[PDB]
């Protein structure tokens, strides 16, 4: 499923990050774009501006939205017994990502940027291999739920 | 061109790293595969092995070779006035990376993996935005030189 031990690691870390989600959501996306600058081109609101990424107001709104959706899905994973998303559905997410040509490589880059952002966000006391694994696995479940809706039938 | 200052930054860092190029070259490749595990499937000696990535004998040899080739290209960039690649040719590298299907996204990931590896190889004191930019720009010149030979 998603173990009680992993739920606890997710819950205590999200307890901290949820209070700085504006900043962390943006740092998450900046880190994606540092690793893969080509990814910038996929987002119309980036394609249509030249302001520093750090300054782009539509990026901030979008970034926090996605980061919050991701962390909320991880935080409810055990309680709900499945991936849940608020404000949208897995079918809509799958259709959108398919249309925008999001590939396995994009998901792998984003997984790493998320885990590097969470590592930078958390007290050194609570960072470790268990924490990294709990978040990576919750992310993996989320992506697999999206990919179901990007493949036939 | 490539400035005297950028050369100096590359030279004093490579002076440290060259003493540890085996370990560093593998660190560099493990970081590539950490970020993008699908890149593993590009390397036939990875696709066909039983053993963990970290222990693979062929990976170690390949990793040191690319790491050294990259750092020497950067170390020689100003002196030579252009990108050189040791024991080979830009035409051969281009042909090879074209044949194995290496794409712009692979070069982006690998750039980031190189810069993190180098950061972690250097005292926090030798690091900073100009050091990062010197290496990033040398890497960018190396990649542009290779890509020239992957296109008509
Ligand atoms: C678990 C991972 C992901 C989640 C939960 C997620 C979620 C979302 C959501 C909620 C939207 C719609 C936003 C809106 O209402 O406008 C969206 C749009 C989009 N996503 Fe993702 N996404 C994920 C991964 C990715 C990845 C890896 C990429 C590529 C690096 C990506 C590229 C896009 C693009 C190009 C759009 C269209 C942008 C737009 O709405 O104008 N997404 N994503
Ligand atoms: C600065 C960038 C790079 C340099 C200097 C470089 C250099 C090399 C060299 C020297 C070889 C050996 C060719 C031979 O033995 O004939 C090689 C092979 C190869 N490279 Fe790269 N490479 C670079 C980037 C990449 C990237 C970004 C990828 C993909 C993530 C990649 C994938 C491959 C593959 C699949 C091979 C063939 C594997 C094999 O030799 O069996 N390389 N590279
Ligand atoms: C997806 N943003
Ligand atoms: C090329 N490795």
Chain A residues closer than 8 Å to B109 by CB: 35-36, 105, 109
Strand boundaries in chain B, DSSP class E:
none
In the numeric block, the tokens 């997710």 are attached to A10
Q: Which CATH architecture has domain A1-153?
A: Orthogonal Bundle (1.10)
- Could you count the other beta carbons within 10 Å of the beta carbon of residue B17? 20
Report the atom number in ligand 2 closest to the C-alpha of B69: 5
Q: How would you class A109 by CB atoms within 10 Å of its CB: exposed for 0-12, middle for 13-18, buried for 19 or more?
A: buried
| Residue nearest (by alpha carbon) to ligand 2 atom 31 | B102
The answer to whether B128 and B73 are in contact (CB under 8 A) is: no
| Rounded Cα distance, A12 and A78, in Å | 14
A87 burial via Cβ count (<10 Å: 0-12, 13-18, 19+): exposed
> At how many Å resolution was this determined?
1.8
Q: Report how far residue B4's alpha carbon sits from residue A24's, in angstroms, rounded to the nearest whole number.
A: 38
Domain boundaries, chain A: 1-153
Of the candidates A123, A126, A93, the one whose C-alpha atom is nearest the C-alpha of residue A20 is A123
Q: Which helix (H) or strand (E) holds A25?
A: helix A21-35
Q: How far is the CA of B93 from the centre of ligand 4 (A)?
A: 10
Residues A77, A10: contact at Cβ < 8 Å? yes
Closest Cα partner for B42 from B96, B1, B78, B5? B96
Residue in the structure block whose two tokens are 């990062």: B132
d(CA A29, CA A40): 10
Distance of CA B125 to the CA centre of its chain: 22
Give the distance, in angstroms, between the CA of residue B74 and the centroid of all CA atoms in the same chain. Answer: 10
| φ, ψ at B117 (rounded to 5°) | -65, -45
Provide the 3-class DSSP secondary structure of residue B62.
helix
Among the four given CATH numbers 1.10.490.10, 3.10.20.30, 1.10.287.110, 1.20.1070.10, the one describing domain B1-152: 1.10.490.10
Rounded to 5 degrees, φ, ψ at A86 are: -100, 150
Whole-angstrom distance, CA of residue B132 vs CA of residue A50: 23
Which residues sit directly before a break in chain B (C to N > 2.5 Å)?
none
**Tokens 């959501």 label which residue?**
A25
Q: Closest Cα partner for B27 from B49, B53, B46?
A: B53
């Amino acid at each position: 499923v998603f173990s009680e031990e992993k739920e606890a690691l997710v819950l205590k870390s999200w307890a901290i990050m949820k209070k700085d989600s504006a900043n962390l959501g943006l740092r998450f996306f900046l880190k994606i774009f540092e690793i893969a600058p080509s990814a910038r081109q996929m987002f119309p609101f980036l394609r249509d501006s030249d302001v520093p990424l750090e300054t782009n107001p539509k990026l901030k709104t979008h970034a926090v939205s996605v980061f919050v959706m991701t962390c909320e899905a991880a935080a409810q994973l055990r309680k709900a017994g499945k991936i849940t998303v608020r404000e949208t559905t897995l079918k809509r997410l799958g259709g959108t990502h398919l249309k925008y040509g999001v590939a396995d490589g994009h998901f792998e880059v984003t997984r790493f940027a998320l885990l590097e952002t969470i590592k930078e966000a958390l007290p050194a006391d609570m960072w470790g291999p268990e924490m990294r694994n709990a978040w990576g696995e919750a992310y993996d479940q989320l992506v697999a739920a999206i990919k179901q809706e990007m493949k036939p039938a």
